Amino acid sequence: VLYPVGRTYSNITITLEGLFPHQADRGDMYVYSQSHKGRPFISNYSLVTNDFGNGIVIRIGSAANKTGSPIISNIASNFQIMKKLYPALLFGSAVGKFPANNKTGAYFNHSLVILPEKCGTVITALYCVLEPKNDTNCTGSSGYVSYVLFENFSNLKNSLQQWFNIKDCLFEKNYNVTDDEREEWFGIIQDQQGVHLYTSRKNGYSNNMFLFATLPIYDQILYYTVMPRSINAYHAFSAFYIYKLHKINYMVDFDVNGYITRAVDCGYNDYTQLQCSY
Amino acid sequence: FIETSIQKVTVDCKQYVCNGFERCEQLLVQYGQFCSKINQALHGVNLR
Amino acid sequence: FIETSIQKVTVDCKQYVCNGFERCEQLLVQYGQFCSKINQALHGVNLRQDDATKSLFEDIKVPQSVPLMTSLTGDYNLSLFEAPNYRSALEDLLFDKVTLSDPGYMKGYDECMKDLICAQYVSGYKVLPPLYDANMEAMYTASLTGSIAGSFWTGGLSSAAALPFAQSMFYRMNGIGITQNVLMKNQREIANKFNQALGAMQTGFTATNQAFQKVQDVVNANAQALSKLASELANTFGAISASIGDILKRLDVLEQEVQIDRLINGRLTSLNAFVSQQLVRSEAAARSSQLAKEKINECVKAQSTRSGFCGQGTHIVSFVINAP
Amino acid sequence: KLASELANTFGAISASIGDILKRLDVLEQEVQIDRLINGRLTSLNAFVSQQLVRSEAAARSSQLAKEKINECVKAQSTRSGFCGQGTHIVSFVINAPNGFYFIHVGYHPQDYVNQTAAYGLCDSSSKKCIAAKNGYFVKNDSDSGSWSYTGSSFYQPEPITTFNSRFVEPEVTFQNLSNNLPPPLL
Amino acid sequence: KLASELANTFGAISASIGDILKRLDVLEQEVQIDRLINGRLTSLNAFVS
Amino acid sequence: GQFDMDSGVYSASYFNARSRGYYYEAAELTECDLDVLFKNDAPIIANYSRRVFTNCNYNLTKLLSLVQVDEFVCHKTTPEALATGCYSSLTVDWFALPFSMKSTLAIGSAEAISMFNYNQDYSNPTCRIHAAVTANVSTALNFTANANYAYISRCQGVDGKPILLQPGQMTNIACRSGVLARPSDADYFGYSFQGRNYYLGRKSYKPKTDEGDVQMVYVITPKYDKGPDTVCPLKDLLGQCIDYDIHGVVGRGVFQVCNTTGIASQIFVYDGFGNIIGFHSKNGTYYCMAPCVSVPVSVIYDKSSDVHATLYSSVECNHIKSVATVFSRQTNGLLQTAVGCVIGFRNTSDTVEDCTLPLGQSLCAKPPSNNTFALVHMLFQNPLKVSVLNSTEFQVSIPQNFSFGITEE
Ligand SMILES: *[C@@H]1O[C@H](CO)[C@@H](O[C@@H]2O[C@H](CO)[C@@H](O[C@@H]3O[C@H](CO)[C@@H](O)[C@H](O)[C@@H]3O)[C@H](O)[C@H]2NC(C)=O)[C@H](O)[C@H]1NC(C)=O
Ligand SMILES: *[C@@H]1O[C@H](CO)[C@@H](O[C@@H]2O[C@H](CO)[C@@H](O[C@@H]3O[C@H](CO)[C@@H](O)[C@H](O)[C@@H]3O)[C@H](O)[C@H]2NC(C)=O)[C@H](O)[C@H]1NC(C)=O
Ligand SMILES: Nc1nc(=O)c2nc(CNc3ccc(C(=O)N[C@@H](CCC(=O)O)C(=O)O)cc3)cnc2[nH]1
Ligand SMILES: *[C@@H]1O[C@H](CO)[C@@H](O[C@@H]2O[C@H](CO)[C@@H](O)[C@H](O)[C@H]2NC(C)=O)[C@H](O)[C@H]1NC(C)=O
Ligand SMILES: CCCCC/C=C\C/C=C\CCCCCCCC(=O)O
Ligand SMILES: *[C@@H]1O[C@H](CO)[C@@H](O)[C@H](O)[C@H]1NC(C)=O
Ligand SMILES: *[C@@H]1O[C@H](CO)[C@@H](O)[C@H](O)[C@H]1NC(C)=O
Ligand SMILES: *[C@@H]1O[C@H](CO)[C@@H](O)[C@H](O)[C@H]1NC(C)=O
Ligand SMILES: *[C@@H]1O[C@H](CO)[C@@H](O)[C@H](O)[C@H]1NC(C)=O
Ligand SMILES: *[C@@H]1O[C@H](CO)[C@@H](O)[C@H](O)[C@H]1NC(C)=O
Ligand SMILES: *[C@@H]1O[C@H](CO)[C@@H](O)[C@H](O)[C@H]1NC(C)=O
Ligand SMILES: *[C@@H]1O[C@H](CO)[C@@H](O)[C@H](O)[C@H]1NC(C)=O
Ligand SMILES: *[C@@H]1O[C@H](CO)[C@@H](O)[C@H](O)[C@H]1NC(C)=O
Ligand SMILES: *[C@@H]1O[C@H](CO)[C@@H](O)[C@H](O)[C@H]1NC(C)=O
Ligand SMILES: *[C@@H]1O[C@H](CO)[C@@H](O)[C@H](O)[C@H]1NC(C)=O
Ligand SMILES: *[C@@H]1O[C@H](CO)[C@@H](O)[C@H](O)[C@H]1NC(C)=O
C-alpha cells in the first residue's frame, strides 16, 4: 500500500483512490543464486520482458532468517540461512532484440537502470541508453546467452559497462541506505510529473511506502525486467516478489504514529464491496 | 382496510445515478458522499 | 420504549451557508430569502415540542402520592423503583447502559475551545436544552410510581387510598380471575415469582432486549441526523473546492459567482432536507406522545381491562421509567 | 411561501422570464430559464411534500376526533386523562375553521381530608362479611366501633344500608365487629 | 416515478451518459454529467423522504 | 424580517472570532530557474519539452517582461491566482507554434496536432499561453528558432490503425523519431523503427515572423494537492483565531501546544474530510489545529415590557472576554446559569410553575412589569402525602369540596 503523499493521518479510516494491488495476488518470484563452479549461475530473467502497466511494488527480502536452498544444491545438508539481496531493475520504453544473436531484452533508447551499488549501501538510479559492445562472446556477438551483474562476497555499473555501453547519460542519482536483513518494500510509478519511487526505509520501522526521488523521466515506461545477479563463492539468499498496481478503490486505516496497519481490497469479494458501500 | 406495511425497496445508488460509467462515477465521488447515506436510510426503513 | 421528544436543533442559516464570507452573503441575498423561513419553521418546531412536553408532564402529575409505598411492602422487592436526586436505581441503570454522549450545557463551548458535540460551534447548528431537567422528570416519575398503590381501585383518581403493595397486588390478581383461596394459599410463591421476574428485568439490559435497542436506535438516529447535517459542508457540489476561501483565491469574479452559487444551492438543499426531516419526526413524536398519555392513564394509573394493551399476557401492574 | 418564492432570481439576472428574454441571447436564455425552472420545480416539490406530511397528520387527528366524539360526547368516559382533565362528566363539540373544538366538563376536587377506612366488615358470630361499593367504610368521629359509608368523590358520612354494600366472601383482613352492628349485619 | 426520472435530460443534451461522452468535450461533459447527477440524486432523496 | 415581534426565546446569529495576529513560515525556498524556457533552441511540437518545478520561488514580473501574451486560455485557475497563491507543484510544457494555427490546440479540434503531437490534460488546472518572444529579446538572450519545425500528421502501425496520443503524455518515440529523421514533408512514408514498420506523416510550419519574433505556446499546470504548497510566487498567539501561512496554506484557526501525532516527516495532519487538524514545525514541536469556533447567541424578548435579554448558550462566562469584540456594537451584567451564562438577568430564588419564557432546564424569565427580567425556576408542586398504615386499616383522602373545571382542546 502506497502512503498518501504530502500528508499524514492518525486513527482515521479513509477510502483512498490510486494505484493499489489485488488481494491474494501471487506475484512473480525471482531468486538470485551463487556461483556454481566459478561461473555465474542465473535464470531466464534477462530474456523475458514484463509489462509495466501502472507501476509495480516489490516485497523485498521477507524470507531472511529461514532455512534456504542454494539453487545449485537441493540437498538439505547444504541448506543455510537466507541473506538479503537487492535486485537490479531495468525500465524502458522500446524493447527489441540484440542484432548479433537475436536474443530478447535489447532495451533500445533511453532506459532507467536501478542498481544497488557498493556492498548494498547505495541504490543508483541512472537514466541512459544501453548499446551492445562489439566484444567476443558478449552483447552483440554470436556466442552470447545472457548478461550477469556478477559480484563478490564480503559497483555493478562496471559489470554493466562490461556488458553494455553507457552513453547520452542524463542523470546519475545515488541514495544512501543501510545494510540490513529485513523486510522492505520498493515501488515505482509514473505520472505526468515524472517517475516516483517509494521505499520502506523512511520514518520509524514500518512496512509502509513513502515517496522519495521524483525522477525527471517523462517518456512512458512500458516494460521492465529483472537483471540477473550472482555472487561468487554454499550460500542462500532471499527472494523478492513483484506485484502489479491497478486503478482500484481501496479502504485503509491509520494508527497513533501515522502508519497504515490494515487495508481493504474493495472488490475482492462481495463483503469488501459492502464495506466500501457503508 | 388498514395499510400496515410499506413496499420494501432497495436502490443501488451508484448504478441508478451513473449506469456503470467510470467517468460519471469519478464525477459523483467528486460531487460528494451521498450513496452510503441513501443505502443506510433505505436499509433502516426496511429493518424497521 | 416510546420516543416522545425529538432533538431540538437551531441552525444559523447565514453561518451554515456562507461561513462569514461577505461575497457569499451578497450572492445569497441575491439568491432569495431562505434563511428567515428556515429559522421561523425550525423555531416553530421547537415551540411545538416544548408545548408537547408540558402536555405530557401534566398527565404524569398526580394530586396525591404515597412517599412510603415503595419501601413499606410485604415480600415484594420494589427497590428498583425507589426514589433514592429522585432518580431511581433502574433509571440509573438505563441511563448508564445507553451509549449517549453528554450534551454540554453551561460549559460545552469552553470544553470545545480547549465528534458531534464540538461540531455545533463550527458548522452553524446548536442542540437546545430540554424543557425540564432530569431531576424534575425524576420527581414526576417518582410521584407517579408512588401513586399506583390505590389508583386502580374503587377511587377513580378523584380520591386516594393507601393500600400496601401486597394488598394492591392481591386485589389485582383477584379481579383478574384468580380466586381468593388460591391467592391466600400462595403468599410466598407469588412474591418469589414477582421478585425473580424483576431481577431478570434488571439483568436484561443487553443487546437481545428489543426496547433497549429501540432506545439505542433513537439515539443513533439523532446522531446520524446531526452527522448528516455536519458532513455536507465538505461536499464540493461540483465546484473546485468545498471552501469559499479557495474559490475566492483561485478564480475570477464571474466564475466565483457560479462556484459559490452551486455551493449555496447544495447547502440550502441540505438545510431544507433537515427541516423536512424535523417536521416528519415532530409528527411521529406527537403520535408517540398521545400513545404515552394513553398508556400512562390506562396501564400505570389504573389496571387495563382490555387485551393486547399494556404488554402481552393479561395486565397486572405497570411502572414507567424516564428514557434518554 | 408558495406565492413569495416566485420572486427569487435563483442565481439568474432577473426573476422574470420576459426580462431574461429581452436582455440575453438564446444560449444564455436557456441557462437562466433552466435555473428558474429548477428553483420553481423545487418549490412545487417542497409544497407537495408538505401537503403529504400534513395529510398524514390530519389522518391521525381525524382518527382521534372520531374516538373522542364516540367516547366523550356520545357516552361518559371512564378512562382518565382521555376526555380531558379530571373525571369526565359531559362534553360538547364546536365547529372550528380547520377542525373541531371540544369542551370537556370535569369533576375537579378542591379540598381533601384524610380518613381511616376498612377493606370490609364482618360479624364475629355469623361470619357474614360485607364490602362497600363505589365508596369506603370510614370510622365515626364520636365512637371507636361505629362505621359510616362515604362516597368516593365526596365526603358525607351516611348510615350503612343494603343498597350501598355488597355481600362478599370473608377475608382475614376485614374488621371483625362485635357490638353496634350496622343494619346489613344486624 | 422512480423509474421514469432516468429519461429526464434535466437541461442536458441527452438523458444518456454515453451520448454525452460521445459528443461533447471533457469540460462540457463535466457540466452535463453534473446536472444529470444532481437530478438523479434529487429523485433518490425524494424517494427516501 | 419584521418590526413587531412576539415574545419567546429566539435563536440569534452566530458571531465569529476575528483575527488576533498573523503567523508565517516559508522554509526559505530558493528561486528555481525558469530561464531554461528561454535558454536553448525553441522546441519542436513533436519533440516538446517538459519541466516540473518543486520547492522553489519565482518572480513573475521578470518572466512576463520577456514575452508579449497574445491570448491565454485557463481552466479552474486564473493568472492572477498563479501570481498570488501557492500550490504543490508546477509543470511547464513549451513548444513553438505560430498564431495562425492556435485553433488546433483548442478543445474539441479535429486537427492532427491534438491527436498526434500534443493532447492536453484537463483533469488538473491548466493555462495555455500563446506568447511571442520579440527579436530584440531573442538577441538579448540566446533564444533562437533555427530548427526544422514540423508536426506529425500520421502515426500508424502496420495494422493501419492510428495510434492516438493519450492526454498528458509525450509523443510516441517511434513516430517522433521517424518524423524528426525525415528532412522533407511527406504525408505517407514508411519507417522501420527497431524491427517494426510504421507509416508516418510529416507537415512543416514556421513559427518565426517577418520581424523575427518567435511565437511560443506555454502550457502551465499548477497542481493543488493536500499538504505543503512549496511553489510560491515571490511576494513582498496560542488559543486565538489567527491567520496563518505555514507552507503556503492560508486560513484561520486556533493553535495549541499539543501532543505529537502522526509522522513528523509529513508536515500536515489531516482528518477524514480534508481538514488540517495539526502540523509539525521546525525545532520538533507539534501544534494541533482547530477552526476558530463561534459563540451561540440566543435572545429573550417580551412584547409587554419591551425588554430584551441576551443568552449566550452553553458558554462559560470567562471566555466571553476573549471574543468580546465580535458581537454587536452595544455589548457587564455577569451571571452564571445552567443553560449557559447570560447577560441582562437578575438572579432570584422565586419559583413559578407556569412561565412563557423558558430558558431551558427548569429555568424561566419573569417579565419586569424594573427594566430587566428575573431568573426564576420552574416549580414542582408537591402532591398531598398519604401515609400507609401498617395495620388492617388504611388511609384515604376523600374530597370535601369541588368545582366544575372546564378543559378545552
Ligand atoms: C532477521 O533477523 C533480524 C535480526 O534479528 C531482524 O532485524 C530486526 O527486525 C526487527 C523487526 O521487528 C527490529 O525490531 C525493531 O526494533 C525497534 C527498536 O530498535 C522497535 O522500535 C521496532 O518496533 C522493531 O521491534 C530489529 O531492530 C531488527 N534488528 C536489527 C539488528 O536491526 C529481521 O527483521 C529478521 N528478518 C526476518 C525476515 O525475519
Ligand atoms: C522581479 O524582477 C524585476 C526585474 O525585472 C524586479 O524589478 C527590479 O527591482 C529592483 C529593486 O526595486 C530595482 O532596482 C532599483 O533600481 C533603482 C534605479 O533604477 C535604484 O535606485 C534602487 O535602489 C533599486 O536598486 C530594479 O530597477 C527593478 N528592475 C525592473 C526592470 O523592474 C522586481 O523587483 C522583481 N520582483 C521581486 C518581488 O523581487
Ligand atoms: N534460495 C532460496 N530462496 C528462497 O526464496 C527460499 N524460500 C524459501 C521459503 N519461501 C516461502 C515463501 C512463501 C511461503 C508461504 O507459505 N507463504 C504463505 C503466505 C501467507 C500470507 O500471505 O500471509 C502462504 O501460505 O501463502 C513459504 C515459504 C525456502 N528456501 C529458499 N531458498
Ligand atoms: C528532443 O529534444 C531533446 C532536448 O533538446 C534532445 O535531447 C538532447 O540531445 C542531444 C543530442 O543527443 C544532447 O546533446 C542533449 O544533451 C540532449 N538534451 C536533453 C535535455 O536531453 C533530443 O535529442 C531531441 N530528440 C530528437 C529525436 O531529436
Ligand atoms: C471544409 C470544412 C468545412 C466543411 C465541412 C463539411 C462537412 C464536414 C462535417 C462535419 C465535420 C466538421 C469538422 C471540421 C473541423 C474544423 C475545426 C477544427 O478541428 O479545426
Ligand atoms: C485511536 O482512535 C480510537 C478511535 O476509535 C480511539 O479510541 C483511541 O483512543 C485512539 N488512540 C489514541 C492513542 O488516542
Ligand atoms: C525463457 O524465456 C524465453 C524468452 O526468450 C521464453 O520463450 C521461454 O518460455 C522461457 N522459459 C521458461 C521456462 O521460463
Ligand atoms: C537472426 O534472425 C535472422 C533472420 O530471422 C537470421 O538471418 C540470423 O541468422 C539470426 N541470427 C542467429 C544468431 O540465429
Ligand atoms: C531512439 O534510438 C534511435 C536509434 O538508436 C534514434 O534514431 C531515435 O532518435 C531515438 N529516439 C529518441 C526519442 O531519442
Ligand atoms: C572478486 O575479487 C577478486 C580478488 O580481488 C577479483 O579478482 C575479482 O575481479 C572480483 N570479482 C568481482 C565480480 O568483483
Ligand atoms: C552517502 O553516503 C556516503 C558514504 O558512502 C557519503 O560520502 C555521502 O555524503 C552520503 N550522502 C548523503 C546525501 O548523505
Ligand atoms: C571466484 O572465486 C574463486 C574462488 O577463489 C576464484 O578462483 C575466482 O577467480 C573468482 N572469480 C571471480 C570472477 O571473482
Ligand atoms: C431487592 O433488589 C435489589 C436489586 O436486585 C437488591 O440489591 C436487594 O438486596 C433486594 N432486596 C431484597 C430484600 O431482596
Ligand atoms: C389523619 O392523619 C393524622 C396524622 O397522621 C392522624 O393523626 C389522623 O388520625 C388521620 N385522620 C384519621 C381520620 O385517621
Ligand atoms: C377476623 O377474624 C378472622 C377469623 O374468622 C381472623 O382470621 C382475622 O385475622 C380477623 N381479623 C381481624 C382480627 O381484624
Ligand atoms: C442564584 O441564586 C441561587 C439561589 O439564591 C443560588 O443557588 C445560585 O448559586 C445563584 N447563582 C450563582 C451563579 O451563584
Author numbering:
A (entry chain C): 50 to 203, 211 to 289, 295 to 339
B (entry chain A): 775 to 822
C (entry chain C): 775 to 858, 866 to 895, 903 to 1112
D (entry chain B): 1016 to 1201
E (entry chain A): 1016 to 1064
F (entry chain B): 340 to 575, 586 to 680, 689 to 726, 735 to 774
Authors' own words:
Merbecoviruses from bats, pangolins, and hedgehogs pose significant zoonotic threats, with a limited understanding of receptor binding by their spike (S) proteins. Spike (S) protein is the major viral surface glycoprotein of MERS-CoV and forms homotrimers. For the MERS-CoV S-trimer, NTD is known to mediate cell adsorption by binding sialic acid, while RBD is known to bind the human dipeptidyl peptidase 4 (hDPP4) as the entry receptor. The S2 subunit mediates membrane fusion and exhibits a higher level of sequence conservation among CoVs.
In addition, S-trimer structures of six merbecoviruses from different animal species were determined. Different from previous MERS-CoV and MERSr-CoV PDF-2180 (31) S-trimer structures, densities that can be modeled as linoleic acids (LA) were identified in RBDs of most of the currently reported S-trimer structures, with CN-HedgehogCoV-locked-2 S-trimer being the only exception. Consequently, the identified fatty acid–bound 3-RBD “down” conformations for the merbecovirus S-trimers are also designated as locked conformations. In the characterized merbecovirus S-trimer structures, the putative LA carboxylate group interacts with a serine from a neighboring RBD via hydrogen bonds. In contrast, S-proteins of CN-HedgehogCoV, EU-HedgehogCoV, and SA-BatCoV are unlikely to bind sialic acid due to changes in key sialic acid–binding residues. Among our determined MERS-CoV S-protein structures, receptors for Japan-BatCoV, CN-HedgehogCoV, and EU-HedgehogCoV remain unidentified. The comparison of their RBD structures with MERS-CoV-RBD shows that the four conserved hydrophobic residues are either substituted with nonhydrophobic amino acids or displaced in position. To date, Japan-BatCoV (HKU5-HKU25 clade), CN-HedgehogCoV, and EU-HedgehogCoV (SA-BatCoV-HedgehogCoV clade) have not been shown to bind ACE2.
